[PDB]
Specification:
The structure is a homodimer. Chain A has one domain. Chain A contains one helix and no strands.
């Protein structure tokens, strides 16, 4: 298999930026108080 | 073609989380002063 790895890979980075975007939102409060 | 789209897709989200991680670093200064 090969395309299956891509499908699992894109979902992984989808998860990366998803959780990472949550991090930006956490600093938002650290800036806002 | 199909796998070519995946290759361009993963690089896109790679770019997404890359630039997004740069955003977290910008708020770091907004928290640090």
């Amino acid at each position: 298999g090969s395309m299956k790895q891509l499908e699992d890979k894109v979902e992984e980075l989808l998860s990366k930026n998803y959780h990472l975007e949550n991090e930006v939102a956490r600093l938002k409060k650290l800036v806002g108080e």
